Design a protein around this motif. Sequence first.
Motif, PDB file in Angstrom:
ATOM      1  N   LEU A  72     -35.439  13.846 -37.474  1.00  0.00           N
ATOM      2  CA  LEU A  72     -36.390  12.810 -37.502  1.00  0.00           C
ATOM      3  C   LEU A  72     -35.567  12.838 -35.941  1.00  0.00           C
ATOM      4  O   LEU A  72     -35.890  11.754 -35.136  1.00  0.00           O
ATOM      5  CB  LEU A  72     -35.941  12.169 -38.315  1.00  0.00           C
ATOM      6  CG  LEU A  72     -36.701  12.338 -39.622  1.00  0.00           C
ATOM      7  CD1 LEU A  72     -35.945  10.980 -40.590  1.00  0.00           C
ATOM      8  CD2 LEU A  72     -37.921  12.413 -39.735  1.00  0.00           C
ATOM      9  N   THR A  73     -34.294  13.250 -35.735  1.00  0.00           N
ATOM     10  CA  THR A  73     -33.678  13.021 -34.903  1.00  0.00           C
ATOM     11  C   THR A  73     -33.159  14.164 -33.320  1.00  0.00           C
ATOM     12  O   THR A  73     -33.736  15.285 -33.581  1.00  0.00           O
ATOM     13  CB  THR A  73     -31.931  13.107 -35.266  1.00  0.00           C
ATOM     14  OG1 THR A  73     -32.069  13.664 -36.563  1.00  0.00           O
ATOM     15  CG2 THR A  73     -31.187  11.528 -36.086  1.00  0.00           C
ATOM     16  N   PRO A  74     -32.653  13.258 -32.199  1.00  0.00           N
ATOM     17  CA  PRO A  74     -32.287  14.337 -31.277  1.00  0.00           C
ATOM     18  C   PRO A  74     -31.500  15.631 -31.079  1.00  0.00           C
ATOM     19  O   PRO A  74     -30.574  15.537 -31.887  1.00  0.00           O
ATOM     20  CB  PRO A  74     -31.735  13.093 -30.450  1.00  0.00           C
ATOM     21  CG  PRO A  74     -32.367  12.215 -30.178  1.00  0.00           C
ATOM     22  CD  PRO A  74     -32.527  12.395 -31.407  1.00  0.00           C
ATOM     23  N   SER A 108     -30.433  14.252 -38.950  1.00  0.00           N
ATOM     24  CA  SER A 108     -31.016  14.162 -39.930  1.00  0.00           C
ATOM     25  C   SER A 108     -32.458  13.605 -40.417  1.00  0.00           C
ATOM     26  O   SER A 108     -33.294  14.647 -39.876  1.00  0.00           O
ATOM     27  CB  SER A 108     -31.864  11.821 -39.686  1.00  0.00           C
ATOM     28  OG  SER A 108     -32.543  11.535 -40.353  1.00  0.00           O
TER      29      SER A 108
END
Lengths: 202, 200, 201, 201, 201
Positions: free
Chosen positions: E98-100, E116
């Motif tokens: 969900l994250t960079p 995440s």
Amino acid sequence: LDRADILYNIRQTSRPDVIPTQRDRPVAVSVSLKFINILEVNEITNEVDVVFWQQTTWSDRTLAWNSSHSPDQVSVPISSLWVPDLAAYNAISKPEVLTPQLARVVSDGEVLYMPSIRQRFSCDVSGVDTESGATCRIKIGSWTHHSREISVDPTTDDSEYFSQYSRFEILDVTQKKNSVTYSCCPEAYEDVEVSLNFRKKG
Amino acid sequence: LDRADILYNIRQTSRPDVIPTQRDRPVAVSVSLKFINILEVNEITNEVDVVFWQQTTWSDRTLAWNSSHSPDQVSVPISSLWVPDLAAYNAISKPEVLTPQLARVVSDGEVLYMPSIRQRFSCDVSGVDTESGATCRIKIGSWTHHSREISVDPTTSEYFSQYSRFEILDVTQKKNSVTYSCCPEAYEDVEVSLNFRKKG
Amino acid sequence: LDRADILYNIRQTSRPDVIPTQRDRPVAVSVSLKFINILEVNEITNEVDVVFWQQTTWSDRTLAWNSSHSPDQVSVPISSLWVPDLAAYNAISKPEVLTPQLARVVSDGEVLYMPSIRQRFSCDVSGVDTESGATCRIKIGSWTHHSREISVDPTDDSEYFSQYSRFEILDVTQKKNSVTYSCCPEAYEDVEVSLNFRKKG
Amino acid sequence: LDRADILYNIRQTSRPDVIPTQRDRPVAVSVSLKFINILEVNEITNEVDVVFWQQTTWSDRTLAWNSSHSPDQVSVPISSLWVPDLAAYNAISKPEVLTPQLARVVSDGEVLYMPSIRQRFSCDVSGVDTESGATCRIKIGSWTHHSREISVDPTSDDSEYFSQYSRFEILDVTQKKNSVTYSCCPEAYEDVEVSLNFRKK
Amino acid sequence: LDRADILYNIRQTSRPDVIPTQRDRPVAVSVSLKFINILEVNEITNEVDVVFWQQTTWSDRTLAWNSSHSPDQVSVPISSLWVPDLAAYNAISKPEVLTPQLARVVSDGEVLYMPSIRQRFSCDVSGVDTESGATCRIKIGSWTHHSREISVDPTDDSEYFSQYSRFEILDVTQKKNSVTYSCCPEAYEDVEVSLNFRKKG
Ligand SMILES: *[C@@H]1O[C@H](CO)[C@@H](O[C@@H]2O[C@H](CO)[C@@H](O)[C@H](O)[C@H]2NC(C)=O)[C@H](O)[C@H]1NC(C)=O
Ligand SMILES: O=C1CC2(CCNCC2)Oc2ccc(Br)cc21
Ligand SMILES: O=C1CC2(CCNCC2)Oc2ccc(Br)cc21
Ligand SMILES: O=C1CC2(CCNCC2)Oc2ccc(Br)cc21
Ligand SMILES: O=C1CC2(CCNCC2)Oc2ccc(Br)cc21
Ligand SMILES: *[C@@H]1O[C@H](CO)[C@@H](O)[C@H](O)[C@H]1NC(C)=O
Ligand SMILES: *[C@@H]1O[C@H](CO)[C@@H](O)[C@H](O)[C@H]1NC(C)=O
């Protein structure tokens, strides 16, 4: 030779597009499915959603190195290797690969690739809620290579890796070789037929 | 020539963006669908979800090699080849390719590409639960090449899943040539009529 | 020049990141939606799922070649061309492109790109089950280019529409709109497409 | 300088992995969400599906050019630029980008990136079917850069472009700065907290 | 050294395919899950959908630089680094990140990567609607590296868990296992994470 040198050599001279045939003999590919889970079963549509480890082995002598004072094995991204173009003839979804796309390469050129795959299949779900259970057959072969280029053979406890938390249980797994000639084509295509005998837990 | 040399030559020179016309004649593309499964049918929305093998053949002379002490055929990733820009005019989902994206190339330059595709279509589902069944028509042709650049022809059921809720009564595959009001040129298509019904 | 030479020249000198403005005038982009299907309609949520052919035309003089003993037109992958950065302002899903990503290029530098798109929209679905039907408006314009860089202009409404849809088209209008935002001094052009449709009896 | 020269210079020398800090000061990133739609709400699971324009601004002096006899601004693919590594701390889906992935670069090195995003969040949906409505809070900050590398600050009507056809309406939007030090880590991490007060129509 | 020089050096020399073993001793990888949300639970199918931060640490001395008059840390895209090939043995979906995809690299060569992840698991959901709750076990280890190449070791209970989940966390324990399978001569290390949770009710 250290790991860094071996992986450099493989990256620089990897022909991933080139089937590694020796003296015009077929590449011997071993395939064995280890069932991990049965997630969804539909007795009306005759469809199953399964998770399995697809244990795949073959030799590519172009990968080989002298193992004296060197690692016996390295982990290699499959994008740097030729991999067999295996397909399940009765799959109704694309293989969802759940694991890192790395193979193990041995210094003699043996390759072991075992992805965890979630995939949906069209197969016989009848009898799943009976004692003798359903038998779902999955056929896996090379999509484009006939028996003179690729041979597929089943490998040398069927429930050792199967999830204890599935609604289903495995009664039996059999994995047998077929060689088929189709009307289209003069050449024979090899396949492993995997029979999954399973039933709903009571 | 070994496989390694042929696949190197094809990768270096194939020109995947270049339609392989000979002397300003159209590229003759043959297309035949082999139906494998009918997964979902909706008589209210007139939609079907189908799995088929799209048998596709054409010649590309730029691929050819002398076969005399060499393989007769190699497997080539389609990213290294020109492939016809075929589309189903009544598709309502993108083609889901279930198989490895490799074609077979013969030393004379003949190409065979047969992906297994799962796709959804808008077509006539009326009568699916009757004896005479439904007839769903699928039109496939070049998206951007007219009849002077690409011709599409059928070649003239057997591999349908015994475990489908449906059965095939008949498949016909016929050539159409369509001129649209917008555009001066005719576009060729194969029209595939799938006559199928729910099993008793 | 043969096809191979033209496509080589385009691939080698294609600046796909560079808008092809002439003498500081906007690039004139023409957009017309041909509706093919209406798949799902929800009068409660005011959402529609539609399939349309997005007929898109513009000129890029850097693509041009002398046609005199050469093809008049070639098919070019859009990855080798500048394409307008069009977006639907009321889309609630990404455009699903159903067709091969090729454009047609004419020897004078005219480009035709017509993808088949399936997309979901937020719009007025009220009246879909009545005789006068619903009117769903879709606004399409450049996401990042204002009216001095890109102008968007509109060019049988049911000629391509599926006879097997649960819905039928009463009328399609395509009109030019201009938005100026508080943030920004410049106007952004859009084509507003009004789809008047209803459930079949 | 023409557009082609500027975009060539940016493509050839843009270090997209390199945060553009000036004289060891943080990069000042401004973030403001413009809510466009609320698509799905679940009061049982406390989940919302939202479409918003994520207006994002920062300065990158390495992009700057002399604007005399040159364009004041160009459109640049974000793959050619450093972009802040922003994440929504309570997102439960990946951001679905609905728009072309282009930023606007001004000749002074100011960057504007405003993607349209559809994303799902875990937040307080209680009271959505009451007069005072629900308040859903979304926190956005740098995933890997602390306050000495990136500062995030909020920037008129955040709800001006909300869809009139949504089942929901916006009562209020507030956007406030938080600076948090966690037990794990010696440094402070900045976030913008956006409070969306909305209700069923 | 500035950030630009360090990130250039890492991009040019990192060898992302090369496990950073020293003198044929294993790479010590630390793994700890921070649970953020429990989204869907099915007591019939024994499946859970979870969001967690996968805190992952290891040393790669080839990344190290002299920190005198230089940054102590940089953010690096994981595509420029070797990362451990960790997999959850009982996952039934691919990890949705969900994250960079950036890691933090310290000047001494320590790497911190904490994505995440939303992922679905097969585990014991029995007792989720009781006071003592369910205990769901997740096993994480190297997919291809045995204990002579990678060792996996566990590193505040549930401080970042969402207050808006239908579920609450009673306890999290994280313990080391070393397993030899019949197939294979070598032992494979794993962290077993036991998530004791229940419905709030
Ligand atoms: C392609 O270029 C040629 C080469 O100059 C052009 O040929 C000339 O056309 C002019 C103007 O009509 C004639 O009057 C000349 O006699 C031509 N010169 C030669 C050397 O042939 C030609 O016009 C160009 N083709 C097109 C389609 O514009
Ligand atoms: O042309 C082929 C080749 C193929 C493709 C599937 N993998 C084995 C080789 O088998 C066929 C099966 C049926 C038909 Br019709 C054509 C074909
Ligand atoms: O310009 C074209 C060419 C094309 C594009 C896709 N179908 C085949 C060839 O057909 C058209 C159909 C409608 C319209 Br309007 C324009 C066109
Ligand atoms: O800054 C802009 C420019 C933009 C952004 C994307 N679409 C067209 C041009 O339009 C805006 C719309 C709203 C707000 Br608030 C800012 C802006
Ligand atoms: O616990 C942390 C630490 C972290 C994790 C993300 N990378 C920077 C350091 O920052 C946080 C951001 C939000 C929340 Br809630 C917790 C945290
Ligand atoms: C492998 O290397 C050792 C050490 O030099 C040598 O004795 C052995 O015969 C080698 N085999 C080869 C190069 O095939
Ligand atoms: C690092 O730089 C500093 C000062 O420039 C110096 O003390 C030291 O010798 C350098 N090298 C190492 C390995 O610390």
